[PDB]
Amino acid sequence: ALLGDLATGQLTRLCEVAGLTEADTAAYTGVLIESLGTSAGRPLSLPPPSRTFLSDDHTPVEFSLAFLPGRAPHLRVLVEPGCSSGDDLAENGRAGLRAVHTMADRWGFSTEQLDRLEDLFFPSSPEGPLALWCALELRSGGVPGVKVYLNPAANGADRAAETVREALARLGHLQAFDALPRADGFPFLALDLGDWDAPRVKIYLKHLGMSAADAGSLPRMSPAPSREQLEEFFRTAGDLPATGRLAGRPALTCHSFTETATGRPSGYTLHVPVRDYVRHDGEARDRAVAVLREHDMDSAALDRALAAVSPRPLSDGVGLIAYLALVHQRGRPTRVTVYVSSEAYEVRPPRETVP
Numbered sequence: 001a002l003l004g005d006l007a008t009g010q011l012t013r014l015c016e017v018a019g020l021t022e023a024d025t026a027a028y029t030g031v032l033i034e035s036l037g038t039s040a041g042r043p044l045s046l047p048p049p050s051r052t053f054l055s056d057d058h059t060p061v062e063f064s065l066a067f068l069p070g071r072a073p074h075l076r077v078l079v080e081p082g083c084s085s086g087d088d089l090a091e092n093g094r095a096g097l098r099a100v101h102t103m104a105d106r107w108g109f110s111t112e113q114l115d116r117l118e119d120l121f122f123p124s125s126p127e128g129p130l131a132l133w134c135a136l137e138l139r140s141g142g143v144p145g146v147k148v149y150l151n152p153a154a155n156g157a158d159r160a161a162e163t164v165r166e167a168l169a170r171l172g173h174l175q176a177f178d179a180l181p182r183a184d185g186f187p188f189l190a191l192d193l194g195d196w197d198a199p200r201v202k203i204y205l206k207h208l209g210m211s212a213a214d215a216g217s218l219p220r221m222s223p224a225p226s227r228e229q230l231e232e233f234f235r236t237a238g239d240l241p242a243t244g245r246l247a248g249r250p251a252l253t254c255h256s257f258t259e260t261a262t263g264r265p266s267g268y269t270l271h272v273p274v275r276d277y278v279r280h281d282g283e284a285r286d287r288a289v290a291v292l293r294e295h296d297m298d299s300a301a302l303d304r305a306l307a308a309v310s311p312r313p314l315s316d317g318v319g320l321i322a323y324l325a326l327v328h329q330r331g332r333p334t335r336v337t338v339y340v341s342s343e344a345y346e347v348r349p350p351r352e353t354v355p
């Protein structure tokens with residue numbers, strides 16, 4: 001009945017799929033409740049605490065599973081830690097920053113990169129659609145990896161490009177902005193905080209009407225990923241035959257920068273919002289397991305994860321599987337990520353057709 005109790009039940013069942021110990025599970029359920037603030041105790045019969053863009057039903061939680069061949073998926077959870085402040089973006093941002101800085105203190109990492117950007121991303125009268133989200137990578141040992149997501153449009157959508165250009169300059173990535181491919185918008189900037197082999201600055205780009213061929217040409221990273229693999233992923237995720245475009249909710253690309261010498265990204269991820277291109281989650285699950293099997297990943301663990309989040313039949317709604325992503329990063333194996341919704345407030349109805 002309370003938001004924190006649904007969310008921590010779902011997290012608990014997901015930690016089991018990910019193979020985390022009881023100790024680490026208990027740790028991370030605590031962290032999730034702390035991240036929700038007063039909203040953790042909010043009855044689910046009341047409206048969401050904010051009209052957050054984090055999920056379609058405004059649950060301020062979303063999970064994701066990152067798959068590699070030969071092992072269990074890695075589990076991650078995305079939260080709006082200022083959600084208890086509601087829809088006032090300045091107050092929601094201030095509360096979210098306070099949560100991240102509490103995490104940084106607790107786990108002993110620096111926020112200097114974030115702090116350098118604060119005035120760009122947290123102006124006095126910010127514009128939507130978000131102020132601050134946080135994702136936690138739920139690593140064995142109970143000390144998570146921390147990622148923060150900021151709004152390039154905070155100073156107005158017309159200033160998003162300028163804001164991203166300035167952020168990249170402040171972080172020392174003076175060639176990165178001009179390395180990005182063209183796009184239709186800059187919806188997010190994200191930072192890896194804390195202990196990472198190579199922490200990334202991540203720039204997210206929106207592409208309206210992307211085709212399969214476009215999905216394989218948009219990488220800017222060195223070395224370039226396989227075009228054929230990207231095209232096939234896009235076709236499978238959108239159910240496009242071998243014209244065909246994703247002209248509803250747009251596909252996004254993410255370009256990651258981890259070192260400043262090359263001037264080039266070290267990563268590219270293609271994100272397909274599959275929820276807008278299926279009749280129901282049985283179709284989205286079928287597409288997700290097709291991608292997983294193509295890349296020699298553990299699709300039965302996805303099936304277990306879906307049942308961990310929700311007991312409903314997959315065909316009784318749409319939006320449980322929010323996004324599918326194919327992830328390339330320099331010197332790392334290709335990874336597939338599935339983003340799974342909490343559906344604490346609504347189950348969107350199934351569709352008779354997808355036009």
Ligand SMILES: N[C@@H](Cc1c[nH]c2ccccc12)C(=O)O
Pocket residue numbers: 053054055056062252271273322323339
């Ligand atoms: N729900 C938002 C943000 C979001 C949540 N999970 C995501 C995964 C990938 C990309 C964006 C997102 C959107 O649809 O854009």
Ligand SMILES: CC(C)=CCSP(=O)(O)OP(=O)(O)O
Pocket residue numbers: 064066078135147149188190254269327337
């Ligand atoms: C939450 C949003 C905006 C995007 C999801 S991309 P991500 O941060 O999950 O990507 P990684 O798994 O960190 O590469």
